[PDB]
Design a protein around this ligand. Sequence first.
Ligand code: HEM
Length: 147
Amino acid sequence: RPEPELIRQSWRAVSRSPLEHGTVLFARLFALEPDLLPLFQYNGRQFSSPEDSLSSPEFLDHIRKVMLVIDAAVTNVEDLSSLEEYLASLGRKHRAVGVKLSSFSTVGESLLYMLEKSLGPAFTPATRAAWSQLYGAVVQAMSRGWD
Ligand code: HEM
């Protein structure tokens, strides 16, 4: 369904520097949902600022994890069904720590923003639709974990 090449070629722009792009995504995510900032708990305590967390090792490591899972959706775009069981367990893991499934819609909005910022006009209507469809499928798979 999602045109693989549109997904792959657009992803290569951000996958180059995952951490930098990941930050852009999370900055927009925290602006859309401030309530997420506290959900990051290290060996106790959290982050005073959106910006303070962007210094935490755990938090940066999480950026990387997020981008790796999006990378898996890209390398499995021609057969996302294979990822279903992994994403369901990932969904459960997030439910376990207090994240609401609805927050993953915000992540999607944030992902598109990150792509808009990086690609500009190269982020075409067709590319945008492909991403909405891909990410929508990822989140559908993850929703199996809220059981
Ligand atoms: C919606 C906002 C999100 C919040 C508040 C959140 C929060 C967390 C927290 C607290 C952890 C446990 C600590 C850690 O392992 O770093 C975690 C783990 C993880 N998250 Fe997220 N997360 C969010 C979105 C995402 C997204 C969109 C993805 C990718 C699809 C993702 C991928 C992962 C992975 C791969 C792990 C490690 C799972 C494991 O321990 O096996 N997270 N997340």
